[PDB]
Amino acid sequence: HMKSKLPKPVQDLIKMIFDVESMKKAMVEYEIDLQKMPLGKLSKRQIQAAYSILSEVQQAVSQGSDSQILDLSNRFYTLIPHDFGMKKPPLLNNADSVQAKAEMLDNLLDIEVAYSLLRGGSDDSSKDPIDVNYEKLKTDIKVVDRDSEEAEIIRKYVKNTHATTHNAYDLEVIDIFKIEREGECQRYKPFKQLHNRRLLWHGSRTTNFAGILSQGLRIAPPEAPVTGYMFGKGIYFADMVSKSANYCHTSQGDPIGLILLGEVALGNMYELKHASHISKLPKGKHSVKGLGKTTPDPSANISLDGVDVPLGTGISSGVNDTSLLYNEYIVYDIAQVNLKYLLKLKFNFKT
Ligand SMILES: C[C@@H]1Oc2ccc(CN3CC=C(c4ccc(Cl)cc4)CC3)cc2NC1=O
Fold this sequence. Notes:
Distance between the termini: 44 Å
Binding site for NAD(+): 202-204, 211, 218, 244
Shape: globular
Order of helices and strands: HHHHHHEHEHEHEHEEEEEEEEEE
Strand order of the largest sheet: 1-2-14-5-3
Bound molecules: ligand 1WQ
Helix content: 25-40%
Subunit structure: Interacts (when auto-poly-ADP-ribosylated) with AIFM1.
Protein name: Poly [ADP-ribose] polymerase 1, processed C-terminus
CATH topology of the largest domain: Phosphoenolpyruvate Carboxykinase, domain 3
Number of helices: 10
Domain PARP alpha-helical: 3-119
CATH class of the largest domain: Alpha Beta
Strand content: 15-25%
Active site: 328
Radius of gyration: 21 Å
């Protein structure tokens, strides 16, 4: 084949995210039986059916028996075969059960997209599959020069926002990509001048990124239990790189991860200290801010192409009795996010 003219870092990026073995590895991590539910059998309608049962389970939890909880638990495992042998799976009887399975199903929606891109489309042996797969993403991906101002700013953001309670590892930036998803700037237009636009982190596991690049960040579907998420069904962001880096789920067994920087239009924030499982905002609000005990120092704010970058070192917010150590930001309209960069990071585990 024609061997591909993309920069090496972009080629390695494409390789990372279309890797089928990594998809399978995520699936066995969630304890999915690949014999009964293989990658090629994953479907949106089965995932949705499973979210519905999970909603039924949330119901029965909110209103207190181990009798009835069993039936519902079993129905969930019927739709998403798990790896338990001649079994009796564990009972899904609490809110952690519901959170953990909802998060798993969210992930499967991204994995199904990646796999379906990989298996739809056309097969031409005279083309580099790196080029073929790049094209499937409908995203322009550039290498940001190590020496530019934007790279300096981004590297300072990484450097200053690593939380002390997340110090079992530290981070090196391997590559910085400037990314532009087709149509997304257009989607963003009504928000592009809202007040309180901010450049924020979103980390995810590398097997989500084909999904994220091809479809954007998305909100969980109507079947998903709103209770499965601390601030209900929106798109979540952090201002501390280490908070988002934790969602990469890297390890000694795989210490390379990916994390996004997005322009997020926050406008009038609804400030909350504790769980609130909503699907719509009260009138007048554009986002939720989960108030952290620690914040990047407000006076160290820098502007990048007109957007605030909260890269100050962590100081006390002053906020008293909060469920959150660090800030969280949630929007409930996909159109309020314009993805700007993708970082590839090395995690150095100090354990
Ligand atoms: C700070 C922020 O917090 C997170 C919370 C949850 C995730 C995991 N993602 C997994 C799957 C998602 C998804 C996929 C497809 C659809 Cl259709 C809807 C939602 C979005 C959520 C990551 C983060 N990362 C953070 O940094």
